[PDB]
Every structure is written in structure tokens, then in C-alpha cells.
Amino acid sequence: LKESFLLFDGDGDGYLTLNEFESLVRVLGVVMETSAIASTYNSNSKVRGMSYELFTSCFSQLKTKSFNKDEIKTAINVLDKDKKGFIPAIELRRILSTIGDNMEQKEITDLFTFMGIDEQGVVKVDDFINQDNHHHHHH
Amino acid sequence: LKESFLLFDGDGDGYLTLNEFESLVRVLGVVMETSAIASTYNSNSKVRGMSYELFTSCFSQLKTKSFNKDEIKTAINVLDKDKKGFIPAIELRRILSTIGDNMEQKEITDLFTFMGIDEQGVVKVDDFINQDNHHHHHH
Ligand SMILES: [Ca+2]
Ligand SMILES: [Ca+2]
Ligand code: NA
Ligand code: NA
């Protein structure tokens, strides 16, 4: 990963800025709110920025605290093999409980309420993934 | 402050996004790292974003945890009334110790080392304020 770190270190000093950190972690597959990524940066950077070894520690921890888009998609596709485009909201709740731990049950309900998803109904998978990316980028 | 909050709430739902929060807090005079602002947002927002009452609590706390540019400038100008453009680095250290508490002594030293400022020397005030704004925006 050192090659990739240094690639994203735009000024060649061995430290990432906050935008370079966010951009690298997203490139590497992390799916989560910008402010949560920024918060990890704030707690694990020196004045100069984030060094390679703080980065690998943070990146390991981000990786546990979240999922990637391959992971969510595989789990969704398992329940829509016919490609109808929809899954049950409660099965989405299961998946999101299962694959990353940056949502508790109460945060899932608040997310479903925000998006207009009923607990006994279905969710349109493309719209959900798109809205959730968008949400994450702005929060 | 409610009028200003709702002004920066771009979609009229009563909640700020992370960029609207950062932009409003900066407009209101807060001087501090983006990732520290983002970290406060991450800890004090619901799924929908940041409500007016979470905002006024956060904003009060940001205000204590930092300074504004009027505050630093007044304190600098007190030591350069002749407008030479320079102050002693140790007097800058005093000021930064004094007027916001998001720097400890060790973070001041690391900042001075980063900018090439010697402890027994002087600091060029315009260059310092400019570099520090820049630093804060990218970290
Ligand atoms: Ca760098
Ligand atoms: Ca809003
Ligand atoms: Na490490
Ligand atoms: Na409040």
C-alpha cells in the first residue's frame, strides 16, 4: 500500500492532507460518511498531516468499521437473483446490520425514514445505493 | 442565529449538511482545521444532518475551542504598532497559547518546525496568518 499512499501524497513530503486521505480511502473501497473519515483523520494526524504508518492503522480500522460496495452488492444480489431490482426492507436491515458496524438499529430506522422506506415494504436497490453514496458524501 | 442557519440550509429541511456546517461556522469567524469542524459534525448530527439546536450547542463549543481572526489580529497588532510586519516567535507562542485551546505546547513547536520558524527568532505576520489558514483548510 505504500506505493498508493505516496501516489496520493501530492506534494512528496510523506504526509497526506485530509482530502488526499479521504480520496485514497474511498479509492480503496471504504463506504462511509465523509465526516466519519475526517474525524479519523483529525484523531490520527500530526501537524504535518497523516504519515504512512498512521494511515495503515487508520485504514485497517476504517475497513472493519464499514463495508465496501462489492460486499453490499454481493449480499444484495443473493436476494435478487432474478434481477427484479427490489429487495425487502427488512432484508436490507439485516445486511446493513451484518456487513459494517457504523449503523445501530436506531440509525437504520432513521435512515429508512429519511429515504421513505417502510419496514414492511421493499426497497429499490439502484435508488438506495445511489442515495446512500450521495448521503455519505455530504455528511 | 436562526436566520443564518436557515439561510445556509440549502434544501429547506431544517438540517445542515457537513459542507453547510463548515461554511457557516467559518463565515461566523471560527478559525480551525477542517477535520476538527468535521469531527464535531460527525459527533453531533442525526442521520438527517445537523438541526438548529445541535448547531447552537456545537457552535458555542467551537467558539471556546478556537479563536477568530479579529482576536488573533488584535493580539498581534498590540506587539507590532509600528507595522514592521514581524513579531517574536515566542510572543506568537504566547498568543496562540492564550486565545484558543486547540494547540498544546508540543503542537505549537510542531507547527513552528513545519513552517520553519525558530523559537528564538521572528515571524513574518502576513505569511504566518496566510499559511495557517491554508493549513487549516487542508487538514
Ligand atoms: Ca503530502
Ligand atoms: Ca438541509
Ligand atoms: Na500502521
Ligand atoms: Na443548542
Point out the residue among B19, B38, B138 whose CB comes nearest to the CB of A42.
B38
- Rounded to a whole number of angstroms, the distance from the CA of A86 to the nearest CA of chain B is 23
A7: number of CA atoms within 13 Å, CB side? Answer: 9
User: Kindly report the CA angle at A137 between B59 and B42, in degrees rounded to 5?
Assistant: 35
Would you call B75 helix, strand, or coil by DSSP? helix
Residue keyed to cell 429541511: B13
The interface residues of chain A toward chain B in range 84-113, judged by CB-CB distance below 8 A, are 107, 110-111
Rounded Cα distance, B58 and A128, in Å? 30
Structure resolution, Å = 2.0
> A34 — contact with chain B (CB < 8 Å)?
yes
Rounded Cα distance, A53 and A55, in Å? 5
- Rounded to a whole number of angstroms, the distance from the CA of B81 to the nearest CA of chain A is 31
Rounded Cα distance, A24 and A2, in Å? 12
Rounded Cα distance, A69 and B37, in Å? 27
Point out the residue among A35, A48, A138 whose CB comes nearest to the CB of B42.
A35
Rounded Cα distance, A83 and B8, in Å? 41
End-to-end CA distance of chain A: 27
Rounded Cα distance, A34 and A38, in Å? 6
Would you call A95 helix, strand, or coil by DSSP? helix
Residue A94: all three cell numbers together = 439485516
- CA-CA distances (angstroms) from residue B56 to B4, B25, B44, B63? 11, 10, 11, 10
**What domains can be seen in chain A, in order of their start residue?**
1-66 (1.10.238.10), 67-139 (1.10.238.10)
Nearby residues of B96 by Cβ (< 8 Å), 6 or more positions away: B103, B108
Residue B5: all three cell numbers together = 442557519
> B19 — contact with chain A (CB < 8 Å)?
yes
- Rounded to a whole number of angstroms, the distance from the CA of A82 to the nearest CA of chain B is 32
Beta pairing, strands B86-88 & A122-124: unpaired
Instruction: Give the burial string for B17-40 (b: 16+ CB within 10 Å, else e).
Output: bbbbbbebbeeeebbbbbbbbbbb
Alpha carbon A100 to chain centroid distance? 8
Number of neighbours of residue B116 by Cβ within 10 angstroms: 9
Rounded Cα distance, A99 and A104, in Å? 12
Query: Which DSSP state fits A49?
Result: B
Rounded Cα distance, B112 and B135, in Å? 12
Rounded Cα distance, A60 and B23, in Å? 31
Count residue pairs from A and B with Cβ separation < 8 A.
66
Number of neighbours of residue A70 by Cβ within 10 angstroms: 10
